[PDB]
Symmetry: D2
Subunit: 141 residues, 4 copies
């Protein structure tokens, strides 16, 4: 069915000037952009956004990086969007993306496992949580 998912273009991809190319990719893939904004996570908000990983070893690095500069979030809508967007961005490790998914966003714009260009919701539950964290219903148009 038609679904909504969240992507966030990370500070590394922002700095590389990849924003337009990244959005264009999702447009060409046939998604509708339903919400879009540039903003900046505070460390606290980034921590809340990533609450599920608070126990993980990479947590602090992730929170700091994701609050180190402005990011751009978008709500993408389309058939099977959550699963399809995951596949489009590719594996978390940018280097591995270049090895196994050479057309993926992370292969094209990601540097490594931390500076990997982009985030996307990994499940229906996480999509619901993440979209609401960033955008209100008033912002979805």
């Amino acid at each position: 069915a038609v679904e909504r998912t969240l992507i966030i273009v990370k500070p590394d991809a922002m700095e590389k000037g990849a924003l337009g190319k990244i959005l264009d990719r999702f447009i060409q893939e046939g998604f509708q952009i339903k919400a879009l904004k540039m903003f900046r996570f505070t460390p606290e908000k980034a921590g809340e956004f990533y609450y599920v990983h608070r126990e993980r070893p990479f947590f602090q690095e992730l929170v700091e990086f994701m609050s180190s500069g402005p990011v751009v979030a978008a709500v993408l809508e389309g058939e099977d969007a959550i699963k399809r967007v995951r596949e489009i961005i590719g594996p978390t490790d940018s280097e591995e993306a270049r090895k196994v998914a050479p057309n993926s966003i992370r292969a094209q714009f990601g540097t490594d496992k931390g500076k990997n260009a982009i985030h996307a919701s990994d499940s229906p539950e996480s999509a619901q949580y993440e979209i609401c964290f960033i955008f209100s219903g008033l912002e979805i148009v």
Copy 2:
């Protein structure tokens, strides 16, 4: 447990200059205001916000009224907030509120069944939906 709920001060109460008194009441009742903003529903958004009532006879009147002027929404947090806030605002019919709940918000500031001063989420499920409709996680502070 500690809960969050949504209130919206409606155009009638806004015009009456009741906004400060209404917020003060919830403050005195011991709630934390976690989010707050003045905005205006488009007819479309008001329709979406009230989707559950699309079948009801009052629907069009409600949507028009709720988009007829600016409103103010707040997220209220506190122990048992959802049920407590419902009780504080009182029955939907302002006139009946004056009869059976004379200290309720609707008794004090409501006019009738339509111009009844204020909205509050009526359940945990509707609270979750309504809060996200109006406020993002970024706006809850």
Copy 3:
């Protein structure tokens, strides 16, 4: 003529539960609230908002305090609003406000010179800058 000015309710007054009473005061004084929101200054933003005082000795304390917790900003509209609102809030030193302007907001809710409850634009030029810093034209309704 009819003017617009900005107020911000500071963290001290927020913690005291004074928000509703403060807004009510301005409503009773005959002002229209044209915009309203709860948000939180980052230290960087608070610094920008107060750029004119960057040279002053109190600057760092002010910036830290104003980013120490959530605040609420409102746009107030009315005849001669800028000068009238200044007079309603009273002198910067809360203690002095109690001595020379006992009905002022700062006399009622302020503690001292730093925790002085509320901010208001001090001139037409600063009003224009401050309103735009906090609210877009899209948020003025």
Copy 4:
């Protein structure tokens, strides 16, 4: 000197899927994107945004079109940004743009005089007004 200007990607360019390519163009031209969001003008807001043209014959058509669907606004920052961005988008009539400025945004993505893909501030004064209309200082990051 370094300046800020506003662009708005119009509903026609949005529908053509041109958003990514348009932003990428400005990135390649060496501008920083300081703010970005997808939103929708109400007819009233579009009218306010375009107040200078209220007397013009095209006014009503412009207001309706610009409120006919979601748009995307960005703040662009760079040396001589206001003048440079004007030149990049090209003449208002998309067809004339293809004739005299074949590399301009409007030549590439515009259809005619009304569906001409994109708006940009035409002067320092209008830039100041337009940026503030769409984005608060809190949204510029």
